[PDB]
From a paper:
VHHs correspond to the antigen-binding domain of heavy-chain only antibodies (hcAbs) that, besides conventional IgGs, occur in all members of the Camelidae. Notably, VHHs are characterized by long CDR3 loops (average of 17 amino acids (aa) in contrast to human HCDR3 with on average 12–13 aa in length), which is often a feature of bnAbs against [name]-1 and may allow penetration through the highly glycosylated surface of Env into conserved epitopes not accessible to conventional antibodies. Overall, we could select Env-specific nanobodies from 25 families, of which six nanobodies showed potent neutralization of primary heterologous Tier 2 [name]-1 strains from several subtypes in a standardized pseudovirus-based in vitro neutralization assay.
Crystal structures were determined so far for [name] (2.3 Å resolution) and [name]-28 (1.15 Å resolution); for A6 no crystal structure is available yet. The CDR3 of [name]-28 (19 residues long; H93-H102) is two amino acids shorter than that of [name] (21 residues). In both structures, CDR3 is tethered to the body of the [name] by a disulfide bond between residue H33, and H100C or H100B, in [name] or [name]-28, respectively. CDR2 (H50-H58) is 9 residues long in [name], and 10 residues long in [name]-28; however, the H52A insertion in [name]-28 is accommodated by a bulge in the loop around residues H60-H62, so that the CDR2’s are the same length at their tip, and both adopt the canonical structure H2–9A, with residues 52–55 forming a type-I β-turn in [name], and 52, 52A, 53, 54 forming the same turn in [name]-28. Nanobody [name] with intermediate breadth and potency was selected from library 54A-1, i.e. from the early library of the dromedary immunized with optC SOSIP. [name] showed lowest binding to optC SOSIP and intermediate binding to ZM197M SOSIP and consequently only showed competition with CD4 binders on ZM197M SOSIP. Because of the small size of the VHHs and the low resolution of the EM 3D reconstructions, crystal structures of [name] and 28 could not be independently docked into their respective EM density.
Residue numbers in the entry: 1 to 82, 82A, 82B, 82C, 83 to 100, 100A, 100B, 100C, ...
Write the structure that this text describes.
Amino acid sequence: DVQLQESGGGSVQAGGSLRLSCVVSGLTISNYCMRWFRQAPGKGREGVASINSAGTTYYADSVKGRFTMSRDNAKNTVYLDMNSLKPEDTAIYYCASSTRVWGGYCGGLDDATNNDWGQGTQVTVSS
């Protein structure tokens, strides 16, 4: 039974940084593509970052450089470090594992199929 629990969302001002956490239960996160998605207000859910079993990371065009994803295997937890946040980063950030893919590789960033999903965490970035 795969459970993902996000935390660390909050209000921050543009320029600032935040760190999100996603604690995973029922899977070893090293063996899967783990992912961050987000849904901005009124918008469809979008891919943000992902990390394959080799710990290689891929990032969406709009966040590359600024955002970084990593992994802590002893805690079975996945992080997103968001640096130089902008008003457009305001969204519910959701963590996911590509549970139903055989392989440790990642689908495309915007590939919301094959996943178990957490519940989301709110990030608000004021001007």
